[PDB]
Amino acid sequence: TSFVLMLLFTGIILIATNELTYNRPREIQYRYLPRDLDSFIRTQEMPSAIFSSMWDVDT
Amino acid sequence: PGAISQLVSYGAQDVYLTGNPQITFFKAVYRRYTNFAMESIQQTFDGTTDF
């Protein structure tokens, strides 16, 4: 199994190097809230957040 | 033993009400505000105050 073993050496080097193809989101950018939802926050009738539920926002 | 059956016997028709909760009805929310104070202060009339 020497030939397949050299093939394994090739594969191990290639795969160990080749990881940098998929990753989490990379760059973080900060933008101010759209006027509607930010104005909604700073008034009454504002319940607490839940960390989820994908709040709908005006455009 | 009462309320529990209402919580556990969940359906589908209620997904619109409680599935993926967006806000917690319970957690009191208030906002901290700016500092201010009030005083009732008399102003005076310029001219006679009469009929």
Spatial contact of A54 and B21, defined as CB atoms under 8 Å apart: no
Q: From the CA of B8, how many Å to the nearest CA of chain A? A: 21
Q: From the CA of B37, how many Å to the nearest CA of chain A? A: 20
Amino acid at B45: F
Q: Is B5 helix (H, G, I), strand (E, B) or coil?
A: helix
Cβ within 8 Å, pair B23-A52: no
Name the H helices within chain A: 2-17, 35-41
Resolution for this experimental structure (Å): 3.8
As a whole number of angstroms, the distance between CA B51 and CA B43 comes to 19
Q: Which of B15, B18, B20, B22 to mutate to test the interface with A (most CBs of A within 10 A)?
A: B22
